[PDB]
Structure formats: C-alpha cells, structure tokens
C-alpha cells in the first residue's frame, strides 16, 4: 500500500519504546531517535547488552543474522529515587531546583497516589515560567508520565519541563507575544 | 482566456474564445438543460446585455460536482467570469465596464465566487449544530 | 483442546493486551481504542482540528 505502510513506519517505531522503558530504564533510557541517561549498561559487559537482543530483535521481529531538558528522560531521571526511598517533599523540589537554572524556563512535577491510605495525596511542585497553553506548548514543553509500583498502592508522576524560548535551539525564537524596539 | 464557475462542489471550467457558436453544458448545447423550470436561471448573463453575434463563442462548460441546481449557477457564473473576461485584455473595456454594470445592478452570484460553504458535523448531534433530544 | 476459531473477534487479539475488545482493524495496526491513544503521537498521529 502506502497508507498501511507509513503507519507501519510509526507503529513499528512505537512498540520499541514499550520495549525500552521496560528493559533499559534501570540502565538509564531517554528516548529513541538512542537518547540515553546512563550509557554503558546499554552496551553491557563490553558486549552483554549491545547484542543480547539485537539477536532477539531478529528472532522476534522478522530479521536475519546481519541486518535534562527532556521530561521523558527526567520523569525517570529519579523515579528510581522514590522506590528507593527519600522524602517526597524535598526530593521533588530538587529536580525543579535542578533544571530551572539550567537556563530553562519553567518546570513542574506532580506525584499522585497514596502517600497515606486515604482519598490519596496529590501534591504538586512547580518552579519558573511554564507557557500553557496554545500551539506554543507543543513547541515548548516536554512531559512524561510513568507509573510507580511501590508495595502498597500504585502512584504516578507527571513531570513537565519547558524549553527556554530565547536559547531555543530550534524553531521559533521567542514567545509569539514578542515586542521590542530601540530608543 | 478561460475561467471557473463555482457555486459549491460544482466548478464549471468555462472555456471562452472567438470560437464556434455552441452553448454547451458538459454535453449537449443549451438544448440540454432540463430543470425546464429554473431553465431561465442561466438566462441572465446575456440578456440585459448584447443578445447575440456569438458564433464566435467557446461556450463549453463542464460542471463536474455539485448537483443539478449547484451547476446551473456554476455555468452562468462560468459565462460571467468568462464573458466579462473576454473584454479584459482582448477587446474594449468601456463595454465591460458598461455591461458588468448591467450585471451588478441585477447581480445574482455572477463574478462573486460564493463565500458560502457547508459546516462540519459535530458528534452527539443530528448534523452540524443540531443535537440529540435531551433525556432526563 | 481447540476448535475452529479462524475468523471473527476471537481470532484477532490486541498487540499490547490480546484484548479482543475494541478492535480497530484500520491501516493494518490492530490495536484497541482503549489502547491506541496512549501510544498515539509516537506514530505521527497528531491533533490539528
């Protein structure tokens, strides 16, 4: 076809990351492009993980023997930190402490679930300048959401960041409100 | 020298030039119209104007789209936007200025490419703006 | 321990669930609608109007 094809470009492009924040998360995954947080444990014991499943990329997926300004990297940046155990009060301000003076405009982190078994904590931790919303958010945000499986009551993060529109690094150069001249 | 005639989905590519003499609508000439009631609707691009000497016409018009009514406007505008377009860079001007004056004192969607187009359907509703009958 | 189940919904299963429920057999992707929009934007399917 061609319709049933360019979908298969993406719907193959999709299940991969189902297979990536499952197997390379503890090994520090950020996003296919392979963007990453930590990058040795992705190779392996000089070869243990590099090819442990490229050899399974084929003998599952029809092949042959031979062929911090991102939220999805920061919403798991320290999702470990929780299921390892710290205060959910100051640890959350640390990450928005972190990215904000990394020349970044705005950040926001929420944690939802049972802090103590009730109608369930939902407290929210913001810092900065977060445009939202219109079209300028698709350009300027990253947001990820990862279910956190601790032993008594699932919880869940919703991190958001935003790109400094000044030091944009691609696309528009500032907020579409922009006004300036010289005296 | 060519134009379009657009009411809706029906766009009549209007051939005009000093041609042959026929009055066609995709098919057969002025012969084949067959509203036979609104038959008189394409009868206002050349009656408050010169009545004839158009054995040098290119009145081919193919209305592919729309409907029977959709395309009756499409050809009188096809003529409009193409007959008035003859005296634009081919022949004198102060009869284009002085019979498109005779059009607009009676104007009925002649050189006005009709801005009015349908609206999309909104779910939970019979058609676009109507809704389902409220249940309590 | 098996009998004809060639066609129909018992035949087709969700890629992410094997959920026979909510199938969308359009464009050869074969996922359920509960299931798809979660994994929507990463296929280039976006929202404009």
């Amino acid at each position: 076809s061609k319709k049933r094809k360019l979908v298969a470009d993406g719907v193959f492009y999709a299940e991969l990351n189902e297979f990536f924040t499952r197997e390379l998360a503890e090994e520090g995954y950020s996003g296919v492009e392979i963007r990453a947080t930590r990058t040795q444990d992705v190779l392996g014991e000089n070869g243990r993980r590099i090819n442990e499943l490229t050899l399974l990329v084929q003998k599952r997926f029809k092949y042959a023997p031979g062929t911090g300004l991102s939220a999805v990297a920061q919403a798991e940046s320290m999702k470990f930190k929780l299921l390892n155990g710290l205060a959910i009060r100051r640890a959350a301000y640390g990450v928005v402490r972190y990215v904000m003076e990394s020349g970044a405009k705005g950040c926001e982190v929420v944690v939802s679930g049972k802090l103590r078994a009730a109608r369930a904590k939902a407290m929210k931790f913001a810092d900065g300048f977060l445009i939202h919303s219109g079209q300028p958010v698709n350009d300027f945000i990253d947001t990820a959401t990862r279910h956190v499986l601790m032993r008594q009551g699932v919880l869940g993060i919703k991190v958001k960041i935003m790109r400094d529109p000044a030091k944009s690094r691609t696309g528009p150069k500032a907020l579409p409100d922009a006004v300036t001249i010289i005296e | 020298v060519q134009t379009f005639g657009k009411k809706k989905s029906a766009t009549a590519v209007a051939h005009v030039k000093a041609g042959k003499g026929l009055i066609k609508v995709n098919g057969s000439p002025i012969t084949l119209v067959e509203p036979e009631i609104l038959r008189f609707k394409v009868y206002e691009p050349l009656l408050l104007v010169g009545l004839d000497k158009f054995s040098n016409i290119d009145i081919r018009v193919r209305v592919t789209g729309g409907g029977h009514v959709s395309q009756v406007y499409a050809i009188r505008q096809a003529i409009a936007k193409g007959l008035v377009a003859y005296h634009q860079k081919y022949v004198d001007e102060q009869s284009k200025n002085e019979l498109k004056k005779a059009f607009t004192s009676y104007d009925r969607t002649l050189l006005i490419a009709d801005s009015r187009r349908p609206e999309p359907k909104k779910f939970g509703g019979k058609g676009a703006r109507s809704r389902f009958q409220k249940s309590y | 321990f098996s009998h004809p189940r060639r066609y129909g919904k018992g035949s087709r299963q969700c890629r992410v669930c094997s959920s026979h429920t909510g199938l969308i057999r359009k464009y050869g992707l074969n996922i359920c609608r509960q299931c798809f929009r979660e994994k929507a934007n990463d296929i280039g399917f976006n929202k404009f109007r």
């Binding site: - | 939970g124 | 798809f36 929009r37 399917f45 929202k47």
Partner: peptide, 30 residues
C-alpha cells in the same frame, strides 16, 4: 500531489461514561 489525511475517530474515554465526546487524530502524508 493531493495529500490524504488518515483519520481515526475514537471516543475519548476508556469506559462508557461521560458525555459522548469523540476526537479525530490525523496522519498527514506527502
């Protein structure tokens, strides 16, 4: 060429409660 939008109209909710709100995703080829 003419572009053809690929449209998938699915209802916005996992369950069957709320107002009956749909939403069309597009794939825009070229």
């Amino acid at each position: 060429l003419p572009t053809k939008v690929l449209k998938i109209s699915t209802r916005k909710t996992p369950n069957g409660e709320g107002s009956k709100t749909w939403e069309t995703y597009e794939m825009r080829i070229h």
